[PDB]
Amino acid sequence: LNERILLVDDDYSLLNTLKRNLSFDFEVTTCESGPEALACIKKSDPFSVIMVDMRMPGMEGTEVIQKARLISPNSVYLMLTGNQDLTTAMEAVNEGQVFRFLNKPCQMSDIKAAINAGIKQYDLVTSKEELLKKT
Amino acid sequence: LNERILLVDDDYSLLNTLKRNLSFDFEVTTCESGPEALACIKKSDPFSVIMVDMRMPGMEGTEVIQKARLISPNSVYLMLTGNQDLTTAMEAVNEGQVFRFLNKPCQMSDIKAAINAGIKQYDLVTSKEELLKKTFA
C-alpha cells in the first residue's frame, strides 16, 4: 500500500496544519509551489496522492497537475478549490486530470476521505498495470 | 470488456438521440425513471456505466444512484445535470457515489468521453475484485 502523499500549497500555516493531522495516518511531504512540486516528484518515489491548491502565485494548480501527469501518470490528483474556481475544476475532472476536487473551506474529514479514496484508486491503477506488465 | 451501459432520463426525445449515437460504440439500454432503472438493474447483467438525469418526477437522480449503488456496487455512475442544479447535486451526493457530472445540454463528445472513462474505471474495479477472489490465475 502506497501511503506517500504530496501537499502543494502556497500557505505554510495550512501546510503545517494538514501535515500535523495527516502524518498520523500517511507519509506527508509538503511543497510551497508548482515548480517546487515538479522538482520533488521528478526526484522522489511515486506519490499515490498529490493535492494542489487551485490559487497560487505564478503557476496555478491546474497547470501543476497537467505537468505532473506527464512525469507521474499513475498518481491520483486532488484539488482544493474555491467557489470561483468550480468551472475550471469541473473541466479538469472531465479531462480526466483531477480525480476529485474539494470546495473550501474544507473539513478535515472531507480531506482525509478524499486522500483515502485516492490511495485506493492508486492501488486499482497500479495493480492493474502490475498485472498487464507480467501477464 | 464490459460495454453495457444504462441511460436513465425522463425525456424520451433525449433518450432516443443518445441511444442512436451511442449504439454505434456501446450496448445501450434506456429507462424513463428511477423505479424503472432499479428494476432493470436487479434483473440484468451488470452495467459498467449508468447515467442518470438529475431532475425527474417522483425520484431524483441522486436518490437513484445511491439506491443503485446497493444493488450494483462496481457500476460507475455518471450524472446528467443542468448547471443550475449542480451544487444541489453535489451537496446531496456523498463522496464516491458520482464518478462524473455532465452539464445539460452536453456535447456528444463530452458524453462519449465520460462513458469511455467509466468503462475503463469499471475495468480497474472488477479486475482488482477478481484478483482478490479467484483461486486460479
From TrEMBL, chain B:
The modification 4-aspartylphosphate is found at D53. Residues 4-119 form the Response regulatory domain. This is Adenylate cyclase homolog. It comes from Rhodopirellula baltica (strain DSM 10527 / NCIMB 13988 / SH1). The chain holds residues 6 to 141 of 382 of the full protein.
